[PDB]
């Protein structure tokens, strides 16, 4: 793809993080802690899942960023409305304000309702995410496989400002402790 010149510097917003997440000093990495990280609760924190938002809000233009997912067994990535539900149980869908893909149990799926099977021959170590606000597009790219297309959400109805969205996943298996990392430009 040729989206690299729309690169944006994303940082993670601590205040939105599930209380078990550990965000690095530079706000560019996040991992699941083995316990509560000793922060106060607030109405913004994701309560049920190991999720966090980027600080940046997008309401126009074209944006591109990359995320490192090396050795993880489970994660969700994409964008979401600024006003998505934070508390309780919910599914990742455009109806609920999410445009995402994930890895779960050795399969990759797009967060449509119902979910869509993805066809990935080369397991990605880094994912590229492209948003075209005006066109209503969110696309995902396999950086490990020379930028090949993973999935395009088109005819998106964003209906609000967008934020970068991350889920590091649970670590019940002991094989999913590795971080998500925002890759340098
Ligand atoms: C919306 C994120 C979500 C729904 S259910 C779920 C889960 C992860 N592991 C077991 N269940 N995560
Ligand atoms: C890792 C996927 C896998 C292993 S063995 C297998 C399969 C065997 N027979 C049909 N399908 N699929």
Ligand 1 binding pocket includes 170 (Cβ within 6 Å)? yes
Kind of pairing, strands 148-153 and 75-81? Answer: unpaired
Q: Which CATH superfamily is domain 4-38+47-182 in?
A: SPRY domain (2.60.120.920)
Ligand 1 binding pocket includes 20 (Cβ within 6 Å)? no
Q: Which of 111, 119, 168, 108 is nearest to 138 (CA)?
A: 111
Domain residue extents for the chain: 4-38+47-182
21 contacts 32 by C-beta, under 8 angstroms: yes
56 contacts 7 by C-beta, under 8 angstroms: no
Which technique?
Answer: X-ray
- Helix, strand, coil % over all residues of the chain, rounded to 5: 5, 35, 60
Declared resolution, Å: 1.1
Q: Nearest C-alpha to atom 7 of ligand 1 is from which residue?
A: 49
CA 168 to chain centre: 9
C-alpha distances in Å from residue 85, one per residue of 34, 82, 99: 25, 9, 14
Q: Nearest C-alpha to atom 4 of ligand 1 is from which residue?
A: 91
Query: How many angstroms separate the CA atoms of 76 and 124, rounded?
Result: 13
Which value, to the nearest 10 degrees, does the dihedral of the CA atoms of residues 103, 151, 53, 24 take? Answer: 60
Token pair in block for residue 156: 């998106």
- Centre of ligand 2 from the C-alpha of residue 107, in Å: 13
- Beta strands (DSSP E) in 71-169 are 75-81, 98-104, 107-110, 116-117, 126-132, 137-142, 148-153, 162-167
Query: How many angstroms separate the CA atoms of 31 and 85, rounded?
Result: 22
Position in ligand 1 atom list of the atom nearest CA 172: 9
Query: How many angstroms separate the CA atoms of 29 and 24, rounded?
Result: 5
Phi-psi region of 71 (alpha: psi -120 to 50; beta: other; left: phi over 0): left
């Amino acid at each position: 793809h040729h989206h690299h010149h729309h690169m944006v510097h994303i940082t993670l917003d601590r205040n939105t993080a599930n209380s078990w997440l550990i965000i690095s000093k530079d706000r560019r990495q996040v991992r699941m802690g083995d316990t509560h990280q000793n922060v106060s609760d607030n109405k913004e924190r994701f309560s049920n899942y190991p999720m966090v938002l980027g600080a940046q809000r997008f309401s126009s233009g074209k944006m591109y960023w990359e995320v490192d997912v090396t050795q993880k067994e489970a994660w969700d990535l994409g964008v979401c409305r600024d006003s998505v539900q934070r508390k309780g149980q919910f599914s990742l869908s455009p109806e609920n304000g999410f445009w995402t893909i994930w890895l779960w149990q050795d399969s990759y799926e797009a967060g449509t309702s119902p979910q869509t099977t993805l066809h990935i021959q080369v397991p990605p170590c880094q994912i590229g995410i492209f948003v075209d606000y005006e066109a209503g597009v969110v696309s995902f790219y396999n950086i490990t496989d020379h930028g090949s297309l993973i999935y395009t959400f088109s005819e998106c109805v964003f209906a609000g400002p967008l934020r970068p969205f991350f889920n590091v996943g649970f670590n019940y298996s002991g094989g999913n402790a590795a971080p998500l990392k925002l890759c340098p430009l």
